[PDB]
Amino acid sequence: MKVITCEIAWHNKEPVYSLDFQHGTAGRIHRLASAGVDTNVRIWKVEKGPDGKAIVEFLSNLARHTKAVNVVRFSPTGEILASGGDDAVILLWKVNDQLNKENWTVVKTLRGHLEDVYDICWATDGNLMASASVDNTAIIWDVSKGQKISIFNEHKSYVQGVTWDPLGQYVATLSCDRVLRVYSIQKKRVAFNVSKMLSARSYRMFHDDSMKSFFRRLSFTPDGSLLLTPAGCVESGENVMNTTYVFSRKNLKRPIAHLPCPGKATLAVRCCPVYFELRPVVETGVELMSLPYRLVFAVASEDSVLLYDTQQSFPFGYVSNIHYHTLSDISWSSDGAFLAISSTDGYCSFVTFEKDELGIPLKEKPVLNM
Amino acid sequence: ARTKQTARKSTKKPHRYRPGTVALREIRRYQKSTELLIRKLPFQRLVREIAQDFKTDLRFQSSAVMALQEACEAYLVGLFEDTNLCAIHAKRVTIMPKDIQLARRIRGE
Amino acid sequence: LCSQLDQLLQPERRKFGRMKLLQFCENHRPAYWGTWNKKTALIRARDPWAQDTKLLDYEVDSDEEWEEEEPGESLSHSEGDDDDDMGEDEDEDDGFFVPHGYLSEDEGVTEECADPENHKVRQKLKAKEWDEFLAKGKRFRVLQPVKIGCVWAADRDCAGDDLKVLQQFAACFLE
Amino acid sequence: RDNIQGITKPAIRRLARRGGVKRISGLIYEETRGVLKVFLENVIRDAVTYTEHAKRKTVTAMDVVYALKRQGRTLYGFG
Amino acid sequence: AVEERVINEEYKIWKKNTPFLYDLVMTHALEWPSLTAQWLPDVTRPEGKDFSIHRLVLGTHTSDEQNHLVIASVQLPNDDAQFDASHYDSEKGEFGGFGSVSGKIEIEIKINHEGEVNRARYMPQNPCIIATKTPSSDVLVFDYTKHPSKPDPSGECNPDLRLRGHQKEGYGLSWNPNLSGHLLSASDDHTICLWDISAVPKEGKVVDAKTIFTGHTAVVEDVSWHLLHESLFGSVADDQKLMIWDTRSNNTSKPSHSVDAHTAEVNCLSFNPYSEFILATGSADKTVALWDLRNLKLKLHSFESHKDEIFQVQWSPHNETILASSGTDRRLNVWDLSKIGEEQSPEDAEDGPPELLFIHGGHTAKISDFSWNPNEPWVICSVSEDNIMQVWQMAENIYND
């Protein structure tokens, strides 16, 4: 595990906000896209150098954006990319067969949030689309036809994170009003809605609008049995403290536990899409969930990023004091060996993972019950 | 010794940088200058009055007001060396209001 | 030393070179700074005033650079930097302050929060603002990167400093 | 309604000094104040749009930040 | 008229040709001409800045105005800023750019002075204490830390110390780098006054004549301590005489050694900051003679490049074998000892001997004074009589090849 601060010109010093790897190809080589206020989407090629360093190179640029972009995520297939800017429109791109080695062309023209967009989510197949914006609205799109199908207006404040159940039965959304909602697929309504919890004094678990954070990103576990929510509040005494909550499919009202994070505040939660064998450890309650196969995920705080696995409660991987400004986004490589760190300073950073450093990836990927 | 003498009285516009080979690490621009260099109170009164102009029954925070401040002079310096480069290209050193307008349009405000 | 003294006595930037600068007080022309790469054997330190044929014209460019003839206010020096003005204000109607702002926010917007909790939050925010004001005197502070390697509970020969540092980052479970 | 000139000559000359000039126009001052005013107005109105869309009365500096990015600039140390 | 026009045209030519020959030129026009000018050992390098700051002690030559001793702080861009790719000009094909951000010259403290400051020098160990020469017999000592920054509204100066022993003005003052408080003074009175201020009381103001030398029969032009010797110093006077005195000698009238200097009167002298056996003296016969302290009978080398009297000669804290001199020719000539006895083509010899390496003729008037920057190498400020003060540095390739 080695951490590389990226000193290269990313968006000619404009801050980064979103980034994504290529899930379709499991090869060591990776195609990386980035989000900045230059209204420019820049594709970059990354791979380990001869010294193992994650060295990067430009690939192509997108400049159609009349406005700044906030969230950028590829399809699970990775062949088609979702692009979202302040100009209140989302275009879909596919590579087409002086400074752009390849041309990437808009494929679909999706609107429905008529405001700045914060978050986008792909389905478990890449044919259904989830997106989050200023507009306090949750939208649902069909990638195949590229038209709006659903609108959820129950939110009172801004929504900074949406995610799709990999099983395909839930949609999880948060408001900036310290309110969390889970949505069914067939029912298309608020399956779950949690904002306050009794201890038995009752108080809200999430941080108010007073936070100096811009994004509240979170993701389903690729297994889909664990739900992770950053920007949590734990009031142990007269004070409240930053944390993130972990939820299981058994109950989405009461999280299984939480991870307190002294100092800075969590803003983004991402899970590596690869599985690993159960690391040999004493049979205790240290593990967050007991599963036949383990998984490792990254959490983006205000400044720090922390690494947790299925067996351990304390973070095994800890990094801090690397980016001067607050964090913006975190991305996992398809192989999981590249963990791309993006902040709001204007640069990114990488942490290279050697093969098997995080365990043996499963020989056969366990199926997910739809 | 040495003969002495009496002294006499003495009287392209977007400079975007290419995606590669750009590792500029200006650290000063990261941190706030903590150097207001503006009289706080005319600024505050002006903000209060224009706010009343727009809407009423509203309150501010000193943090928000000071933030407004550095936003102000940050935009000032940006436009300001923009005008400097314009006037140098304009083959002149005395700054004209047309220079401000031309730089303003260079950004596209 | 002294004893012996008495005894005996009795394109690439590296391809262009160093940045060059020149300023003249007399010029209406602005001061110039640029890298010079022109190589002429006629302009030598031995004969600085020798003609530079096919290199440049011996013609005045400061006048055409800046024929000022305008009220520039002589901003260069001796005026304006020292001038300053004080004043007195009113801040009782619309309080642009941390305590008054918090009070206006709490009066206008009411939530499901206890009054002692609101007082504690206001005190904590004021303390944070005061600490920020005190740390404002730090000004620029060069910051060194920190990185903690993959230390695991299996290993016991790792540095105990990093061990206690990550122990400070414990994961607190709840019953 | 008569605070358009509240911007002081010392403040404007000091801004001039920070940016690095040595010669200034005499009438440019009102143009500076007007550009100030327009940008101030854009900023504050957009912040109001947020705070109203925030369903809130007292605006926060977070609204300032969002207006800043919407118009397209960066804020340092406050996020 | 004709002379003024030809000097103007020569200066215009020098202005046009300086981009190829200088790497650093920083010219300013003074309110009043300065007879004295010198660096400060202290340098200011604020963190987070792309520049360095340097300080200068100068005086004023006012015919009917209160002469003020002046400290000038000067802004110098950093070495780190010396390598940056900002922009490129398609016209000049270089990384140029006129811009507007540059180092600046700022006067910090002015101290009232009784008449023109004939010569100003400070403690080699304490920049707080500075010694100034007056047109009167008096010798005054000023301290910026012990005086208000702005000159006092009262016209009368406020000297912290006044020294006695001389009967009229002079142009020679020096300090002892190895011994604290030891001053060497020169005056038209044909007397060389040695003063020690280390023993002056806190409230004392008048300093007596600790030692008066009278070996010279002419106007003692300059006196200076030895850079390494703790008790040795030399004197130069209008009697074309190079005199060596030892403070340990029991006789203040009998010199330690007496050797003639030239066929013309000599002005100053200078020793190596590193060596201790070689001294440089400039004379009115357009010659500067090197003297080995092993044998003063034979001149080590008498360089010849000026057309008139040479006034001030100074060695290099950076480079042991580097010397330059300026006089009424308005030309400052940089001289190297590594090119001594080197064959050169006549095309490089019409100007003069190959002993010379560089000439600075950017002076409208006679070069009043110069000093070599102990911190920054090759960095020199010189002042002409027309209150013209430039800070300059030549092309790097002229000495580094």
From Swiss-Prot, chain A:
This protein's source sits in the domain of life called Eukaryota
What is its subcellular localisation? Nucleus; Cytoplasm
Entry GO MF terms: chromatin binding; histone binding; unfolded protein binding
- Protease as a keyword? no
Query: What does the record give as the function of this protein?
Result: Acts as a component of the histone chaperone complex chromatin assembly factor 1 (CAF-1), which assembles histone octamers onto DNA during replication and repair. CAF-1 performs the first step of the nucleosome assembly process, bringing newly synthesized histones H3 and H4 to replicating DNA; histones H2A/H2B can bind to this chromatin precursor subsequent to DNA replication to complete the histone octamer.
| Main location class | nucleus
Q: Which gene encodes it?
A: CHAF1B
From the broadest rank down, the organism's phylogenetic lineage runs: Eukaryota, Metazoa, Chordata, Craniata, Vertebrata
Family stated for the protein in its record? Belongs to the WD repeat HIR1 family.
Keywords, comma-separated and alphabetical: Acetylation, Cell cycle, Chaperone, Chromatin regulator, Cytoplasm, DNA damage, DNA repair, DNA replication, Nucleus, Phosphoprotein, Repeat, WD repeat
Q: What is this protein called?
A: Chromatin assembly factor 1 subunit B
Give the record's subunit note.
Subunit of the CAF-1 complex that contains RBBP4, CHAF1B and CHAF1A. CHAF1A binds directly to CHAF1B. Only minor amounts of RBBP4 are complexed with CHAF1A and CHAF1B in G1 phase. In G2 and S phase also monomeric CHAF1B is detected. Interacts with histones H3.1, H3.2 and H3.1t.
CC terms in the record's Gene Ontology section: CAF-1 complex; chromatin; cytoplasm; nucleoplasm; nucleus; protein-containing complex
Q: Name one GO biological process term.
A: DNA replication-dependent chromatin assembly
Give the species: Homo sapiens
Curated annotation (Swiss-Prot), chain B:
Q: Which residues carry this modification: N6-butyryllysine?
A: 9
Residue positions, PTM N6-(2-hydroxyisobutyryl)lysine? 4, 9, 12, 32, 40, 55, 98
Would I find Nuclease among this entry's keywords? no
Per the record, residues carrying Phosphoserine are 10, 33, 62
Q: Which residues carry this modification: N6-glutaryllysine?
A: 32, 55, 91, 98
| GO-annotated molecular function | cadherin binding; DNA binding; protein heterodimerization activity; structural constituent of chromatin
Residues where Asymmetric dimethylarginine is found: 2
Q: Which residues carry this modification: N6-succinyllysine?
A: 32, 55, 98
Task: Name the PANTHER family for this protein.
Answer: HISTONE H3
Name of this protein: Histone H3.1
Ranked from the top, the taxonomy reads: Eukaryota, Metazoa, Chordata, Craniata, Vertebrata
Swiss-Prot record, chain D:
Residues with the modification N6-lactoyllysine, per the entry, are: 9, 55, 69
Cross-link position per record: Glycyl lysine isopeptide (Lys-Gly) (interchain with G-Cter in ubiquitin): 69
Range covered out of full length: 24 to 102 of 103
Question: Which of the residues bear the PTM N6-succinyllysine?
Answer: 9, 55, 57, 69
The reported result of mutating residue 15 to P is:
In TEBIVANED3; results in early developmental defects when expressed in zebrafish embryos
Q: How does it assemble?
A: The nucleosome is a histone octamer containing two molecules each of H2A, H2B, H3 and H4 assembled in one H3-H4 heterotetramer and two H2A-H2B heterodimers. The octamer wraps approximately 147 bp of DNA. Found in a co-chaperone complex with DNJC9, MCM2 and histone H3.3-H4 dimers. Within the complex, interacts with DNJC9 (via C-terminus); the interaction is direct. Interacts with NASP; NASP is a histone chaperone that stabilizes and maintains a soluble pool of Histone H3-H4 dimers.
What is the disease in the record? Answer: Tessadori-Bicknell-Van Haaften neurodevelopmental syndrome 1: An autosomal dominant disorder with onset in infancy, characterized by poor overall growth, microcephaly, hypotonia, profound global developmental delay, impaired intellectual development, poor or absent speech, and characteristic dysmorphic facial features, including hypertelorism and abnormal nose. Other variable neurologic and systemic features may also occur.
Task: Describe the PTM.
Answer: Acetylated as part of spermatogenesis progression prior to histone-to-protamine exchange. Demethylation is performed by JMJD6.
Major localisation: nucleus
In the record, Phosphoserine modifications are located at 25
- The encoding gene is H4C1
The annotated consequence of residue 9 to R reads: Abolished ufmylation
Modified positions (Phosphothreonine) in chain numbering: 58
Native organism? Homo sapiens
Q: Which family does it belong to?
A: Belongs to the histone H4 family.
Keyword NADP in record = no
UniProtKB/Swiss-Prot annotation, chain E:
Any one GO molecular-function label of the UniProt entry: histone binding
The residues bearing each WD repeat, given as ranges, are: 22-115, 116-165, 166-213, 215-260, 261-304, 305-361, 362-394
Q: Where does it live in the cell?
A: Nucleus; Chromosome, Telomere
Q: Could you confirm whether the keyword Nuclease appears in this record?
A: no
Q: Which residues constitute the cross-link Glycyl lysine isopeptide (Lys-Gly) (interchain with G-Cter in SUMO2)? A: 150
> What is the role of this chain?
Core histone-binding subunit that may target chromatin assembly factors, chromatin remodeling factors and histone deacetylases to their histone substrates in a manner that is regulated by nucleosomal DNA. Component of the chromatin assembly factor 1 (CAF-1) complex, which is required for chromatin assembly following DNA replication and DNA repair. Component of the core histone deacetylase (HDAC) complex, which promotes histone deacetylation and consequent transcriptional repression.
Q: What is this protein called?
A: Histone-binding protein RBBP4
This chain's source organism reads Homo sapiens
What lineage is on file? Eukaryota, Metazoa, Chordata, Craniata, Vertebrata
User: Source gene?
Assistant: RBBP4
